[PDB]
Write an enzyme that holds these catalytic residues in place. Structure first.
Site, short mmCIF file in Angstrom:
data_model
loop_
_atom_site.label_atom_id
_atom_site.label_comp_id
_atom_site.label_asym_id
_atom_site.label_seq_id
_atom_site.Cartn_x
_atom_site.Cartn_y
_atom_site.Cartn_z
N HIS A 68 -68.38 8.51 1.40
CA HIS A 68 -69.84 8.54 1.67
C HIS A 68 -70.67 7.38 1.13
CE1 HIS A 68 -69.19 12.45 3.27
NE2 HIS A 68 -68.97 13.04 2.09
N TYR A 112 -63.08 21.17 -4.14
CA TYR A 112 -63.85 21.88 -5.17
C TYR A 112 -63.19 23.06 -5.89
CZ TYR A 112 -66.72 18.25 -3.46
OH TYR A 112 -67.15 17.00 -3.10
C1 LIG Z 1 -74.86 19.59 -2.11
C2 LIG Z 1 -74.31 19.66 -0.73
S1 LIG Z 1 -74.11 18.09 -0.15
C3 LIG Z 1 -72.50 17.54 -0.20
C4 LIG Z 1 -72.22 16.20 -0.11
C5 LIG Z 1 -70.85 15.75 -0.10
C6 LIG Z 1 -69.74 16.70 -0.23
C7 LIG Z 1 -68.34 16.20 -0.16
O1 LIG Z 1 -67.45 16.75 -0.79
N1 LIG Z 1 -68.00 15.12 0.73
O2 LIG Z 1 -66.78 14.65 0.85
C8 LIG Z 1 -70.04 18.11 -0.35
C9 LIG Z 1 -71.35 18.56 -0.30
N2 LIG Z 1 -71.71 20.03 -0.45
C10 LIG Z 1 -73.10 20.55 -0.67
O3 LIG Z 1 -73.25 21.76 -0.81
ZN LIG Z 2 -65.85 16.68 1.64
#
Ligand SMILES: C[C@H]1Sc2ccc(C(=O)NO)cc2NC1=O
Ligand SMILES: [Zn+2]
Ligand SMILES: [K+]
Ligand SMILES: [K+]
Length: 393
Positions: free
Chosen positions: A141, A315
């Protein structure tokens, strides 16, 4: 040889963020507990001879002003005093806020992934490794002058740039993360030599917002890079098989037409059924359902093209370790032709208690829109071949 990026300083730096905590420590410790480390070549992170050399490497993509702001943010966070109104405004102008805040090691943490992914690219260039893995990388990103979605520095773009400029050369970028890989797509939007492909979820209000319909049409590159950016948005709830069937023919057709010199795979674990996002229903299952990630990694590795494998999203830390440990073992098997027997039970190691209460390697889970996308993509690849004067079947 199959390379893996690691080191003691690298581990401390990769485990120093508040968002990803000790995730990297869990991934490398599960790989080590399963006795995979002796089978892999250690790739040490890149280090520079001076601040000027480091700045030259990072500014190959990012602006000097953004790199300066990111270094200042680290310095300001190593003091108890609040940031001044002017300093808050400076950080806001580069989105160094909200999802990308400051912390004591923000710059060292972000640069560590750059150091690792550039060293990984170098090991492929000199042919020391056939495939290199970097579980501390894959920050898709980040933009030229903007932090985005937990990514401060774009390690992928810098690694790809090193690869494309290696001969005095074409790279295929495959993005498996749940989110659209906007930062890498944008960086190579005007370049036909780098072909990008992202499979992801896309819906209204879901991050980052791109990689979908813009009579709605898909944008796909500009100038000499027209038709070089490929996107596949999928509905929530997709299982291993349907996700595998949606990407399989696209992956095979990109290899045949583009004939890349290098493949860069971003392997974000956020598509797993057990990820807090709960969007896709992918697993890490390996039959003797087959994991979507394991099916795509195997297909990419079967082309016999020097490949870079990176981390990214993910996550649920023990479940991300479960999948990336299986990716690591499959890579060894596919490259070396040496069977990697992995016990279905978690071996005893320092982080054993994190895999409870079952202590199993399998994640704890029980299970024509694509056809129109397939016809649209087949037409985009034909136009890419026509514009780039490539010979196709
Ligand atoms: C806070 C939001 S925004 C968000 C931005 C990026 C990612 C991610 O892991 N990209 O590879 C995850 C997100 N989840 C949210 O809830
Ligand atoms: Zn992601
Ligand atoms: K993706
Ligand atoms: K491109």
């Amino acid at each position: 040889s199959v390379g893996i990026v690691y080191g003691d300083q690298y581990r401390q730096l990769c485990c120093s963020s508040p968002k990803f905590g000790d995730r990297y420590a869990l991934v490398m410790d599960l790989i080590n507990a399963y006795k995979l480390i002796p089978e892999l070549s250690r790739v040490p992170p890149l280090q520079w001879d001076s601040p000027s050399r480091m700045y030259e490497a990072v500014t190959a993509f990012h602006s000097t002003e953004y790199v300066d702001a990111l270094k200042k943010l680290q310095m300001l966070h190593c003091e108890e005093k609040e940031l001044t109104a002017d300093d808050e405004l400076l950080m806001d102008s580069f989105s160094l806020n909200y999802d990308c805040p400051g912390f004591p090691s923000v710059f060292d943490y972000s640069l560590a992934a750059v150091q690792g992914s550039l060293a990984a690219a170098s090991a492929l260039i000199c042919r020391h490794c056939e495939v290199v893995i970097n579980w501390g990388g894959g920050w898709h990103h980040a933009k030229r002058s903007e932090a985005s979605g937990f990514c401060y520095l774009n390690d992928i773009v810098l690694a790809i740039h090193r690869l494309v400029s290696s001969t005095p050369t074409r790279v295929l970028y495959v993005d498996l993360d749940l989110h659209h890989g906007d930062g890498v797509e944008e960086a190579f939007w005007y370049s036909p030599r780098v072909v990008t492909f992202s499979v992801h979820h896309a819906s209204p209000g879901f991050f980052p917002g791109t990689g979908t319909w813009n009579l709605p049409i898909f944008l796909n590159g500009a100038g000499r890079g027209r038709f070089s950016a490929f996107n596949l948005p999928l509905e929530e709830g997709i299982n291993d098989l349907d996700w595998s069937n949606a990407i399989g023919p696209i992956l095979d057709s990109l290899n045949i037409v583009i004939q890349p010199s290098y493949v860069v795979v971003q392997c974000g674990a956020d598509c797993l059924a057990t990820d807090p996002h709960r969007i896709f229903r992918l697993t890490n299952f390996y039959p003797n359902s087959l994991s979507g990630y394991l099916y795509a990694i195997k297909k990419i590795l079967s082309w016999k093209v020097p490949t870079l494998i990176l981390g990214g999203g993910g996550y649920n830390f023990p479940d991300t370790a479960r999948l990336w440990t299986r990716v690591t073992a499959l890579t060894i098997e596919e490259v070396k032709g040496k069977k990697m027997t992995i016990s279905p039970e978690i071996p005893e190691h320092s982080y054993f208690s994190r895999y409870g209460p079952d202590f199993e390697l399998d994640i704890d889970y029980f299970p024509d829109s694509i056809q129109k996308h397939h016809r649209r993509i087949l037409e985009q690849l034909r136009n890419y071949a026509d514009l780039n004067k490539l010979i196709y079947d």
